[PDB]
């Protein structure tokens, strides 16, 4: 059963969680090719692993910048989790290491680019196109949540398309192993659950709200709560009001009403029956969950590829030297990395 599968995956996860891999490569073992994106305290690059010729995505984080932004513990969470997980829609760490200046995490490369890019260009996805992606997220969150992990940054920017048109849930910067409630204000304004905004302790139910936002945005082409400034967005999210496009199916609207539910006693994914309330909803009635997990379903969209290491599905970012100081920075802070 699913329960069985998950139990065993947890045994696998806990062993790596309790004894994390460390220092499993070195920078000189990789050829850096192109920046695939940026964040506040680093960048992700396409790299080639020279001894194998494999391409990977290499996340390069500036330790001093991580410290300035108070993201030390969050970054230690990310690496510790990602080295421990294993799931068809995640990119676990193939290698990790650090030097005087930076932290490095090497992951499976997703050549199709961000879902965001394709969503914005095409405008909106059909309900079937949306459901295909949504299904993969439902399973991933089932997996993560069963490991007592909370993900906390679902959005199209953070869903990478692979060569077969399936997705990888990336950007584990805010992911945290927590059994009770937690309090950190983090995520992306459009995707924040009202509990987070209202400075309440919160739990994994915020990931199910975020799912509601994502399915809406995918199917509408814009999110349920938007404005020019965050503060106006926060006002809309808390208010208790959402409007659906007239082209939204009846089933879709009902699912979204149950995901975008301010009342935790009523929010799908948070009830007694957990994720099955989502899996067994009518909007998912055509979804064969095993076929999705097995990646046997035909993707409704598969990206264009010239070949290995092709990056045409990514935007261009300014390239900047990777400089390695002669002095070790922030040694104690990142001792366990």
């Amino acid at each position: 059963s699913v329960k069985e599968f998950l139990a065993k995956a947890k045994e696998d996860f806990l062993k790596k969680w309790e004894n994390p891999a460390q220092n499993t490569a070195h920078l000189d073992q990789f050829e850096r090719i192109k920046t695939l994106g940026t964040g506040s305290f680093g960048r992700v690059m396409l790299v080639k692993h020279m001894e194998t010729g494999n391409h990977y995505a290499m996340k390069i984080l500036d330790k001093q910048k991580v410290v300035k932004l108070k993201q030390i513990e969050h970054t230690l969470n990310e690496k510790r989790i990602l080295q421990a997980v294993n799931f068809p829609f995640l990119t676990k760490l193939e290698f990790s290491f650090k030097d005087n200046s930076n932290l490095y995490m090497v992951m499976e490369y997703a050549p199709g680019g961000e879902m965001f890019s394709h969503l914005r260009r095409i405008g909106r996805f059909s309900e079937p196109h949306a459901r295909f992606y949504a299904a993969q997220i439902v399973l991933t969150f089932e997996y993560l949540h069963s490991l007592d992990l909370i993900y906390r940054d679902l959005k199209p920017e953070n869903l990478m398309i692979d060569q077969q048109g399936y997705i990888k849930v990336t950007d584990f910067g805010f992911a945290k192993r927590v059994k009770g409630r937690t309090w950190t204000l983090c995520g992306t304004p459009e995707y924040l659950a009202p509990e987070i905004i209202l400075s309440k302790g919160y739990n994994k139910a915020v990931d199910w709200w975020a799912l509601g936002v994502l399915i809406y945005e995918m199917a509408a082409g814009y999110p349920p709560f938007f404005a020019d400034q965050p503060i106006q967005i926060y006002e809309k999210i808390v208010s208790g009001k959402v409007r659906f496009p007239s082209h939204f199916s009846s089933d879709l609207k009902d699912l979204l009403r149950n995901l975008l539910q301010v009342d935790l006693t009523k929010r799908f994914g948070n009830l007694k029956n957990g994720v099955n309330d989502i899996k067994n909803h009518k909007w998912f009635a055509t979804t064969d969950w095993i076929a999705i997990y097995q990646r046997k379903v035909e993707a409704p969209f598969i990206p264009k590829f010239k070949g290995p290491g092709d990056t045409s599905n990514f935007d261009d970012y300014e390239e900047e030297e990777i400089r390695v100081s002669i002095n070790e920075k922030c040694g104690k802070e990142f001792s366990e990395f």
């Binding site: 506040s40 940054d153 983090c186 995520g187 992306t188 304004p189 459009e190 020019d228 965050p230």
Partner: peptide, 20 residues
Amino acid sequence: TTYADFIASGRTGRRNAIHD
């Protein structure tokens, strides 16, 4: 239209993560 209001907004590009 809501679409037009979105496209005319300042938040159609990549959205940054927030944290306290």
